[PDB]
């Protein structure tokens, strides 16, 4: 039992490396960010280009949606985040305070807060309404590669090149858990909150419960980039990630076997995303490629 993702659409238009793609929670849209300093919005089901959003002064490493699908936040080498009204394309707020590139970002499920991680080694928590920084966590001793909230916003998980994954109490700022030593290049909670998936730059993904690793997925290449990984849960239960051999890998969540590889890109697949209700994967690639692809499966 394996999925049968097949290519349906190629979303071309960025003019440099794509950095991150995300489906909107309502399923209607895909947002992408790129080194070309733009964000683009695309139809999730037919890949139709919808709009270009502009204003960052340097390349963008991440983008993320608010719960209601009405706002985006982006993280840029310009040391700022920006909050966007996706209807109008306008920048509502510029979040200033990091002292080096902002690398990763996310809303909480309430979407009154944004969390960011930076090459400055900190995690910052921001008020969406005022754009003010509410907390700066001295979270890591090297760049922060990922930050994500759990399902009720009560926890944040962060990962870093310093080899640590840390779970934080949002409200108190306290570190509740620290999860060898390879750089941790990506982390996220599962769609239900109960697990975390972490990538390390030794070509390994791990599913963690107790502070214990329950599964390890390997076979792909990941020694250089902060590649997004995902749980796919609309059909069969898979783990999905890009890879530095230019493929999308899909693994069986429970058996850990590779069940499909998707071939379309001519550079590192930096980012993948899984649609919230249909079996659709978006993939995006770096400078030699510059495209996003939409793939669909019957399971």
């Amino acid at each position: 039992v394996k999925p049968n993702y097949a290519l349906k659409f190629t979303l071309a238009g960025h003019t440099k490396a794509v950095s991150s793609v995300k489906f909107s929670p309502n399923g209607e849209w895909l947002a992408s960010s790129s080194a070309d300093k733009l964000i683009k919005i695309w139809g999730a089901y037919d890949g139709k280009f919808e709009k270009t959003i502009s204003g960052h002064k340097l390349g963008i490493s991440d983008v993320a949606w608010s719960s209601d699908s009405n706002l985006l936040v982006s993280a840029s080498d310009d040391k700022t985040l920006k909050i966007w009204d996706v209807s109008s394309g306008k920048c509502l707020k510029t979040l200033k305070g990091h002292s080096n590139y902002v690398f990763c970002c996310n809303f909480n499920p309430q979407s009154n807060l944004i969390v960011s991680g930076s090459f400055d080694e900190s995690v910052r928590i921001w008020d969406v309404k005022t754009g003010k920084c509410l907390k700066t966590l001295p979270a890591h001793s090297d760049p922060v590669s990922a930050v994500h909230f759990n399902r009720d916003g009560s926890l944040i998980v962060s990962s870093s090149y310093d080899g640590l994954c840390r779970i934080w109490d949002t409200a108190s700022g306290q570190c509740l858990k620290t999860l060898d030593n390879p750089p941790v290049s990506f982390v996220k909670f599962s769609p239900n909150g109960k697990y975390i998936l972490a990538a390390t730059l030794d070509n390994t993904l791990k599913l963690w419960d107790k502070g214990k690793c329950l599964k390890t997925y390997t076979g792909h290449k990941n020694e250089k980039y902060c590649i997004f990984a995902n749980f796919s849960v609309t059909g069969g239960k898979w783990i999905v990630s890009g890879s530095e051999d230019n493929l999308v890998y899909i693994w069986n969540l429970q058996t850990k076997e590779i069940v499909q590889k998707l071939q379309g890109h001519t550079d590192v697949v930096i980012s993948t995303a899984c649609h919230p209700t249909e079996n659709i994967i978006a993939s995006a690639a770096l400078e030699n490629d510059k495209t996003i692809k939409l793939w669909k499966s019957d399971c």
């Binding site: 490396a17 080194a35 760049p143 250089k224 980039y225």
Partner: peptide, 11 residues
């Protein structure tokens, strides 16, 4: 040009 699209050099 962004941080995500530049490699973390190991060795």
């Amino acid at each position: 040009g962004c941080a995500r699209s530049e490699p973390k050099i190991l060795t």
